[PDB]
Amino acid sequence: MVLESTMVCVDNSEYMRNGDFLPTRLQAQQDAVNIVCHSKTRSNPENNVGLITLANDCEVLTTLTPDTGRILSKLHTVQPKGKITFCTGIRVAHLALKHRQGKNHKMRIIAFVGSPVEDNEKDLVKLAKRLKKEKVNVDIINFGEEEVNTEKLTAFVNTLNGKDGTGSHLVTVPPGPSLADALISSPILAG
Amino acid sequence: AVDTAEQVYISSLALLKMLKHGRAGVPMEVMGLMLGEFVDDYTVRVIDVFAMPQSGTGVSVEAVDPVFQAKMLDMLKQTGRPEMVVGWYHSHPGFGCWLSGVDINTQQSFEALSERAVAVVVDPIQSVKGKVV
Amino acid sequence: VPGFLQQSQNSGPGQPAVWHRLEELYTKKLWHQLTLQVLDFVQDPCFAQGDGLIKLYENFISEFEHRVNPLSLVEIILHVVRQMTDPNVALTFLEKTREKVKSSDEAVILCKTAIGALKLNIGDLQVTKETIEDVEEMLNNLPGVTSVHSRFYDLSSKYYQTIGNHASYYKDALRFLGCVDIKDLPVSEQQERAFTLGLAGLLGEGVFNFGELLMHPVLESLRNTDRQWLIDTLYAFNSGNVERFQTLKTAWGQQPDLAANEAQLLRKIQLLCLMEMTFTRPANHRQLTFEEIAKSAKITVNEVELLVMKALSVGLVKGSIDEVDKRVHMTWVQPRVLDLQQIKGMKDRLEFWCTDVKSMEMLVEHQAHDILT
Amino acid sequence: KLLEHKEIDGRLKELREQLKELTKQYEKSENDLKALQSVGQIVGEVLKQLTEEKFIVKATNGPRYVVGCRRQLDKSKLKPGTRVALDMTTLTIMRYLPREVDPLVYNMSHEDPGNVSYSEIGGLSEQIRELREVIELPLTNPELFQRVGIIPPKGCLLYGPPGTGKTLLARAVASQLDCNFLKVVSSSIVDKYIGESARLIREMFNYARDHQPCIIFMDEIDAI
Amino acid sequence: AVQKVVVHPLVLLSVVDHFNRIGKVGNQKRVVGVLLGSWQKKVLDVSNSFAVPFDEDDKDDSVWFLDHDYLENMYGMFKKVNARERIVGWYHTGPKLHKNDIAINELMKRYCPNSVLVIIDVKPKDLGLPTEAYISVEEVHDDGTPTSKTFEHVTSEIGAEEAEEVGVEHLLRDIKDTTVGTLSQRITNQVHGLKGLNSKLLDIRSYLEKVATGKLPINHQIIYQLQDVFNLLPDVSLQEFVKAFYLKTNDQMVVV
Amino acid sequence: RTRLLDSEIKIMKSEVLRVTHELQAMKDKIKENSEKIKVNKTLPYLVSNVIELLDVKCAVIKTSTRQTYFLPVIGLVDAEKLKP
Numbered sequence A: 001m002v003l004e005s006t007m008v009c010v011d012n013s014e015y016m017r018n019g020d021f022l023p024t025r026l027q028a029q030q031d032a033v034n035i036v037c038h039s040k041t042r043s044n045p046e047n048n049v050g051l052i053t054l055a056n057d058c059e060v061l062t063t064l065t066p067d068t069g070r071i072l073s074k075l076h077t078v079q080p081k082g083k084i085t086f087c088t089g090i091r092v093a094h095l096a097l098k099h100r101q102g103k104n105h106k107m108r109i110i111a112f113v114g115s116p117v118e119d120n121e122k123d124l125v126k127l128a129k130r131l132k133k134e135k136v137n138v139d140i141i142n143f144g145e146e147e148v149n150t151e152k153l154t155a156f157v158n159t160l161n162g163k164d165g166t167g168s169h170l171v172t173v174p175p176g177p178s179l180a181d182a183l184i185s186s187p188i189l190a191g
Numbered sequence B: 001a002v003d004t005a006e007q008v009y010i011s012s013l014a015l016l017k018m019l020k021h022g023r024a025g026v027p028m029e030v031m032g033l034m035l036g037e038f039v040d041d042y043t044v045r046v047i048d049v050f051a052m053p054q055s056g057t058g059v060s061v062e063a064v065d066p067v068f069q070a071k072m073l074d075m076l077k078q079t080g081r082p083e084m085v086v087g088w089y090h091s092h093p094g095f096g097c098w099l100s101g102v103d104i105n106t107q108q109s110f111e112a113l114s115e116r117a118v119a120v121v122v123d124p125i126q127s128v129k130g131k132v133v
Numbered sequence C: 001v002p003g004f005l006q007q008s009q010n011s012g013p014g015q016p017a018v019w020h021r022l023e024e025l026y027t028k029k030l031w032h033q034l035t036l037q038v039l040d041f042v043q044d045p046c047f048a049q050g051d052g053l054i055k056l057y058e059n060f061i062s063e064f065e066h067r068v069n070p071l072s073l074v075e076i077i078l079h080v081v082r083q084m085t086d087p088n089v090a091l092t093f094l095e096k097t098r099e100k101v102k103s104s105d106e107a108v109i110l111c112k113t114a115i116g117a118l119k120l121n122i123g124d125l126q127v128t129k130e131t132i133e134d135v136e137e138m139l140n141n142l143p144g145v146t147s148v149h150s151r152f153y154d155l156s157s158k159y160y161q162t163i164g165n166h167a168s169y170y171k172d173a174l175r176f177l178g179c180v181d182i183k184d185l186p187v188s189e190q191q192e193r194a195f196t197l198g199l200a201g202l203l204g205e206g207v208f209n210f211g212e213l214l215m216h217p218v219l220e221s222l223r224n225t226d227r228q229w230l231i232d233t234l235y236a237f238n239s240g241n242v243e244r245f246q247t248l249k250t251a252w253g254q255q256p257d258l259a260a261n262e263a264q265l266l267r268k269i270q271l272l273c274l275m276e277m278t279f280t281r282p283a284n285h286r287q288l289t290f291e292e293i294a295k296s297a298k299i300t301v302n303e304v305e306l307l308v309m310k311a312l313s314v315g316l317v318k319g320s321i322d323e324v325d326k327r328v329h330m331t332w333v334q335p336r337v338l339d340l341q342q343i344k345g346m347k348d349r350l351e352f353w354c355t356d357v358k359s360m361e362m363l364v365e366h367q368a369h370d371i372l373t
Numbered sequence D: 001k002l003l004e005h006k007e008i009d010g011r012l013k014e015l016r017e018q019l020k021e022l023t024k025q026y027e028k029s030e031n032d033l034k035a036l037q038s039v040g041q042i043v044g045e046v047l048k049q050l051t052e053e054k055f056i057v058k059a060t061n062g063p064r065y066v067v068g069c070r071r072q073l074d075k076s077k078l079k080p081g082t083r084v085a086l087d088m089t090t091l092t093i094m095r096y097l098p099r100e101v102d103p104l105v106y107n108m109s110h111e112d113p114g115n116v117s118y119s120e121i122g123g124l125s126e127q128i129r130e131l132r133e134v135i136e137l138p139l140t141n142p143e144l145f146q147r148v149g150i151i152p153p154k155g156c157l158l159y160g161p162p163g164t165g166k167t168l169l170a171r172a173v174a175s176q177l178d179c180n181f182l183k184v185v186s187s188s189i190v191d192k193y194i195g196e197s198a199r200l201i202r203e204m205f206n207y208a209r210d211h212q213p214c215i216i217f218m219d220e221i222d223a224i
Numbered sequence E: 001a002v003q004k005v006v007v008h009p010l011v012l013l014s015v016v017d018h019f020n021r022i023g024k025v026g027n028q029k030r031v032v033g034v035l036l037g038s039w040q041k042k043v044l045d046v047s048n049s050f051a052v053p054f055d056e057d058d059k060d061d062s063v064w065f066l067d068h069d070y071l072e073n074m075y076g077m078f079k080k081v082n083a084r085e086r087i088v089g090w091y092h093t094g095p096k097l098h099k100n101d102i103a104i105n106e107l108m109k110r111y112c113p114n115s116v117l118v119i120i121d122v123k124p125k126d127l128g129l130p131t132e133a134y135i136s137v138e139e140v141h142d143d144g145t146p147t148s149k150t151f152e153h154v155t156s157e158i159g160a161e162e163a164e165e166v167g168v169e170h171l172l173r174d175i176k177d178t179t180v181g182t183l184s185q186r187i188t189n190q191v192h193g194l195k196g197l198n199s200k201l202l203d204i205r206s207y208l209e210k211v212a213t214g215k216l217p218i219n220h221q222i223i224y225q226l227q228d229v230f231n232l233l234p235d236v237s238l239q240e241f242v243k244a245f246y247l248k249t250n251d252q253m254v255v256v
Numbered sequence F: 001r002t003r004l005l006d007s008e009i010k011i012m013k014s015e016v017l018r019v020t021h022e023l024q025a026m027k028d029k030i031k032e033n034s035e036k037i038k039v040n041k042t043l044p045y046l047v048s049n050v051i052e053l054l055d056v057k058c059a060v061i062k063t064s065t066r067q068t069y070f071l072p073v074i075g076l077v078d079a080e081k082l083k084p
């Protein structure tokens, strides 16, 4: 197989350093990158994977490339510290997917949010009906802690889709002690 | 069949990369490939003389690395335009720049590759503003 | 262990609402709202009685958290040394948190500003040369934290207190004045910081134009609330070398520390003439008299010689000592602060130059217009 | 289990050893790879300076040329006679250079083996002390020969029967002073050519003029 | 760092041809491509560079993209074919800068610790030399803000090379060699009197910008200081140059 | 173990460091080998003579055509291998 492009949106904010999740939150998001990068290894290697973040910057260290062992080397010294701004993370992920190599790739993007973002529901509905006018399905896995039941990104899930394009699957964060594989075991079942 | 009077349009960045390329490798003949656009029969343009990697043992047809053709030309495809090659360049600094035996050795390869396969010959030590080398 | 907050859960009114929550913070193993809770323990309005209790537990937070930044650990060890009131246990703790902490968020300079912050009791001469200088030696990466630059003012200004380089109160004043941006500490202490900023800037005479940058906000808000003449006699050291009411009003109000610098403040008004005579006056007059230098300088005739030669020792001017008539010739000078009327009259003579050279330029081109072809 | 730290230290030790050794070998072949595009230059010599921009040189291989300096060649250093570097193609002066050496001089300069001093020879202490008086005294203290104001001697001719230690005397001085013994064997000078041996004599006398305490020796003059 | 630059017009045409590569397609804002460079001394040189695809949406001026893989692969090509060359910065064709350019600059200062930009104009009529140099350093501030990271106008010039104008002065065909003695002096008269003192009138327009506005950085640091370097000559009425007309007669003396 | 399992994550991390070791080693290795294929396979070699080795790591060459050439850059040898 299937043609797509998935932009991993890691969290590098200063809440992602502790160990409420399995041993390390860096290990939780890191093993999430392991299962999505091996998941795109199991997917079409014509597809491409590139790293982006939301906190303190919108970091393009690697190109949206079919290689991923380089990103496996980019798992090191991620240093999660900064201030979350995911609202520009949608747009930087999207023009990141508007400088692609081919249009036969679909656009299904994952996202890793683990801090209270100053996102208006007006902002994510401008971005959400923007993605209605841009044909992108985004399945978000919430990390860290922002809400025990994420609501604004639920509104982004609802306002992204309608009647045909429900590629908005939201694994809301279990911010207490939950496993590194139990959170990601549901998107590997169904994205 | 019947054959029309041909014509070679330039973009002059051709000539700038010939003076800079042959100026850079000035004690040695160089070999390269010339990019442009096949407009029609009686005209053809050069819009890009681009760098080609060195040979150390022999300036020949083996100076064209095909992975540099895929990588170089493909990264020209993800530059602003994927235009078509119009031939090939080289140099002769050591003398009055006539067609070496290498040129007739690879001319049939270059016209197996292209329709025209027009040579580009230069001595980089001629002039400062005047000669059309 | 939650039993430490079962006994230390009581610190104020309405207090265990954050302690019964705190035993969900670290027992549910989140540590950055507990970084906010170390910020809460810095914040805690009390005698700060539990910090000497919590300090072993915060050492434990550094043990089985092993990721948080020790900025808040310095911010809590100033509270612990405030509670215990002796620096040596936090010198053992200080060298401890200097040898065991190599944290990525500027651990070395928070340790050197911990030596600077806890330097006030260990003496300020044996150690202000080595490690206070080692703060900016270790500031080779990025001088933009402004916490290390404000604390760097603090240790560099204690180095100003233990007297060395009076004239480093100008650049030291560029470290407090170049650290603080918005007021973020009480104005009713800031105007005393501007009070002693003008006093110690008057003691440090290396820049001698101390009314230089005084469109600076977090001093000028204090200039409009302090005594109003002190700024005005710094303007009698900035603009006008007259008004003995002003340059003596700094003897009326400021009694001490004037006669120690009084002949050098005479020197500063005797260069304030040197900006007046060619900055303010029309052109230069090409030849400027002993009555002008001596009268503006309120000095005799036989000191204008030492005045202008001493000005050549300063190097502000390169003037020739025209004293065949005791009437000095001018050269280039270092300027003073451009006032708004200096802007406008500068626009007058400057636009005068602009449209005269441009207009007569077009006239010369009009005479040379017929010879082009 | 807890042997994974030991296996991690083994794989990290072998991986870091292969990275440092083989990647540092890629750094040595990186520098040696960078020096591949360099081209050697021309050895020329300044005949004289024509004008401020025009320079009269003659390279060793043949004809005479007039070119200019580059930008910052410091033209006051161009005295007429210096060895300079020329471009291969542009042929203008690249770099003012020091002098040539002609390593035939070096094959008698650095080929003095070790030796026992003048105590090994005996019975010719007149020649020993007398040679000390004629050589070592004017080079150490010329002012004894300048207080009188008469020129010291320069050249000395050892002669006599074969095998009177005329070689080993100068060899013992060549284990006594140890300064600049240019020992000319004076039979391997001529090879076939015209003024080649002459040019060797000019080089020996100019190098001898340079390194001010030179000691000239010449064995077996009778061949030449 | 930087003393100045040495920039051949060849790399400027290497901006021009990619401006032809984008002028046929939807030009969103401008071109941002690589500036390679030959840095030897504190002076600079550029013999070549290349470009790279780039868009930017103007909502937070932070969504903007180059391809560093493309940059280092074609940089591996050009470094391979020429060991002299390395990256020295970037360029942009829209002649006015904006706020994102510090994110472009500081995002590509990771490869080399300087990344100089180049302002050019594809349709220049008013500027002098097109080329321009900044450097992104700090003078902190007088108030000492949190890292006022500032572009600094390093002086810039058109570079030169032997036998590079072999094309150029044969192409243009219009050059009148050695117009000394005829009208070149009055070309420079009109353009320096007019085009110098109009810049003086825009600086006095900026002085009025300090009158009605201009409190941002009123700039009482460099303006009156180098304007006192200008005020080496206070040329007021009555003109005060009695010590300059026998000087003028000495100047007129030998020539007449 | 937990430090043993994180040490096993450091073992796979050191395996990624071994992948970077073979990458930076073998990649730039075989590339610079190919540049030595270009330079070192120029099998007609004019032999010559070393005149001097200046140090301003420079050498002066007397060819078998009895001519002189300067080089400031020595080449693919060592200065210890170069006696006069």
Ligand SMILES: Nc1ncnc2c1ncn2[C@@H]1O[C@H](COP(=O)(O)OP(=O)(O)OP(=O)(O)O)[C@@H](O)[C@H]1O
Binding pocket: D120, D121, D122, D124, D160, D161, D162, D163, D164, D165, D166, D167, D168
């Ligand atoms: N006086 C001496 N003391 C010590 N050893 C001596 C003495 N004379 C000769 N010998 C030894 O015998 C060797 C013979 O001397 P040698 O022949 O080299 O001198 P020479 O200058 O060559 O004489 P010639 O050239 O006329 O045959 C010396 O090299 C040395 O080993």
Ligand SMILES: [Zn+2]
Binding pocket: B029, B090, B091, B092, B099, B100, B101, B102, B103
């Ligand atoms: Zn050829």
